[PDB]
């Protein structure tokens, strides 16, 4: 994950963004996420 904004002005948070403490942080998934995954048929 190659960051953008300046840690200094943006604020702490970018590096580990978008990964869920209770979810991604344990491999564990959420009741409906496989729904999202499977919507990706294009490319």
């Amino acid at each position: 994950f190659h960051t953008f904004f300046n840690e200094k002005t943006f604020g702490l948070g970018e590096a580990d963004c978008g990964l869920r403490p209770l979810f991604e942080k344990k491999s564990l998934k959420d009741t409906t996420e496989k729904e999202l995954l499977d919507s990706y048929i294009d490319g």
Binding site: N6, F10, L12, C17, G18, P21, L22, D30, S39
Partner: protein, 258 residues
């Protein structure tokens, strides 16, 4: 949120409630990008003909909440707003174009199991993830149905609400309304002819349309709920503000004022 479901505690830690101080009513959704900058519909802040000229002093923001009103102790943290930056080409007189708002907290929000930022799109992600028919998750404390069926009190979910939605072909949507779907918006909704119904409602305006990347496993706020089709608007598809298309402006502000 219509035909949404309850959210598992934590399922979207980025979710922020945008509160009115006096009186106290829910005002809008709002994503969190970093322990100090937060994202919302500009219209959630400055729409005059619905009486909105809100300022930093009038509002709070509520981070990592579940129960729409149980002041969840030892979980939700209440940040105060230091300043609100509104895309300045956003002109509430024309249309919903550039319906975007950045809010700087006074105090860096602590992260917990329930507070934790959302990633943002890079052109790379946009192009692989923002496709006609790809589904994306919208979360909110907007009302649950058409507003004079049953009783306000039912229809106002008691915890945070979740709903995924397919992205809509730009002609399909464009054709569907006399509002200009600009360069800087996208459309989410199930097929006109469809067997679920999911959408966002006024109260949901401001929060995050979000998709998870399968390449790097991360959650990216492609949009802002800009004008859902759920509830009273009952038009055809929801418009979202394209977050990426405005990343240039986002940085202009942070860097200037962070």
């Amino acid at each position: 949120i219509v035909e949404g479901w309850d959210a598992e505690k934590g399922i979207a830690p980025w979710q922020v409630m945008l509160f009115r101080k006096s009186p106290q009513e829910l005002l809008c959704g709002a994503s969190l990008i970093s322990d100090r900058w937060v994202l919302t519909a500009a219209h959630c802040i400055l729409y005059p003909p619905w009486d909105k000229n809100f300022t930093e002093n009038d509002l709070l923001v509520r981070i990592g909440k579940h129960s729409r009103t149980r002041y969840e102790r030892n979980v939700e943290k209440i940040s105060m707003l230091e300043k609100i930056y509104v895309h300045p080409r956003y002109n509430w007189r024309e249309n919903l174009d550039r319906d975007i708002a950045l809010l700087k907290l006074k105090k860096p929000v602590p992260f917990s199991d329930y507070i934790h930022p959302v990633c943002l799109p890079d052109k790379q992600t946009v192009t692989s993830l923002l496709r006609a028919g790809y589904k994306g998750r919208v979360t909110g404390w907007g009302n649950l149905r058409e507003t004079w069926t049953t009783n306000i009190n039912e229809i106002q979910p008691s915890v945070l609400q979740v709903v995924n939605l397919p992205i809509v072909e730009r002609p399909v949507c464009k054709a569907s309304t006399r509002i200009r779907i600009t360069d800087n918006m996208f459309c989410a909704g199930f097929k006109v002819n469809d067997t679920k119904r999911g959408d966002a409602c006024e109260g949901d305006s401001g929060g995050p349309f979000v998709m998870k990347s399968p390449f790097n496993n991360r959650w990216y706020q492609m949009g802002i709920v800009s004008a859902g089709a759920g509830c009273d608007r009952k038009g055809k598809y929801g418009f979202y503000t394209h977050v990426f298309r405005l990343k240039r402006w986002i940085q202009k502000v942070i860097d200037q004022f962070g």
